Amino acid sequence: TVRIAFVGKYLQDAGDTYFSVLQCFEHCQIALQVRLDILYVDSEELEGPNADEARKALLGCDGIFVPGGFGNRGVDGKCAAAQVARMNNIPYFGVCLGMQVAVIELSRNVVGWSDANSEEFNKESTHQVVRIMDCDRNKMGANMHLGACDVYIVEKSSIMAKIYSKSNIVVERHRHRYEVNTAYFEDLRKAGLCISAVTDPTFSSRCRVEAVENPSLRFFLAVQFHPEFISTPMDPAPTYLSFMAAAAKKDYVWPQKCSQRRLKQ
Ligand SMILES: [Cl-]
Ligand SMILES: [Cl-]
Ligand SMILES: [Cl-]
């Protein structure tokens, strides 16, 4: 079996929040022919004086996964999940909040900005590594990014390039508001992060980070988009599929061309 730490809430209080995520995991399970054993971990147990107790549980997993979530609850714990993954070379996959915590984690623990956060969780941080873009904001609020958008894979040696069968542009679906702060790209790069996919291949102030990786590690990938929004039993989301492959310690034959479900029509 393949042990994946699912860092968020217990089954009892998750409701139907992870329905589509778990569907996608099931698609991957079938395509790889592996017995998935998800450990549902309460993210709040990964913070505070006793958190080493919870960290030890993550160290026994084959993979560590951080999905999208709501509110600021367990943000520090999700950051700590990304830290364990980065420091122990345990495959990591983050989706939307999962990417943001990878960025925050790295900013605190490698870049050395102890107060690094998203603008969402600490308005008074002097290192808002995740923030609302100026073009998305006004005095009363900001855009809620939904729907499809072109994703430019800009690193040819990346996990993204490989799992999307070397397509330069793919189309994924979104539900987010805050983006990686463009002013800190060099700092993140110096700390080992590879910006592998973006909305704008020129890297302007309007460049929205769609995927980050850590190529020093076997598998560390996190995406802004929600790959579970495009996944079927016969065409599983490549991001989830590659994560589960890595956790299972298995290879996979990627098609010669990216599926039409994730290409521009
Ligand atoms: Cl949570
Ligand atoms: Cl891979
Ligand atoms: Cl967001």
Numbering used by the authors: 324 to 588
What do the paper's sentences say?
CTP synthetase [EC: 6.3.4.2] catalyzes the formation of CTP from UTP by coupling dephosphorylation of ATP with deamination of glutamine to glutamate, the latter to supply the required amino group. The enzyme, which consists of distinct synthetase and glutaminase domains, is rate limiting in the synthesis of cytosine nucleotides required to maintain RNA and DNA levels.
The glutaminase domain of T. brucei CTP synthetase, (residues 319–589), following incubation with acivicin, crystallized in space group P212121 with one molecule in the asymmetric unit and diffracted to 2.1 Å resolution. We now report an improved and corrected inhibitor structure with changes to the chirality at one position, the orientation and covalent structure of the isoxazoline moiety, and the location of a chloride ion in an oxyanion binding site that is exploited during catalysis. The active site is located at one end of the sheet in a small, ordered, polar cavity. The corrected orientation of the ligand now results in four out of five functional groups participating in hydrogen bonding interactions directly with the enzyme, the fifth to a water molecule that is then in contact with the enzyme. The C1 carboxylate interacts with solvent, and the side chains of basic residues Arg498 and His549. Stabilization of the oxyanion intermediate formed during the reaction with acivicin, or during catalysis may benefit from the position of the amine and amide groups of Gln423, Arg500 and Tyr501 respectively forming a positively charged environment similar to that observed near the cysteine protease‐like catalytic triad in trypanothione synthetase‐amidase. This site is where chloride binds.
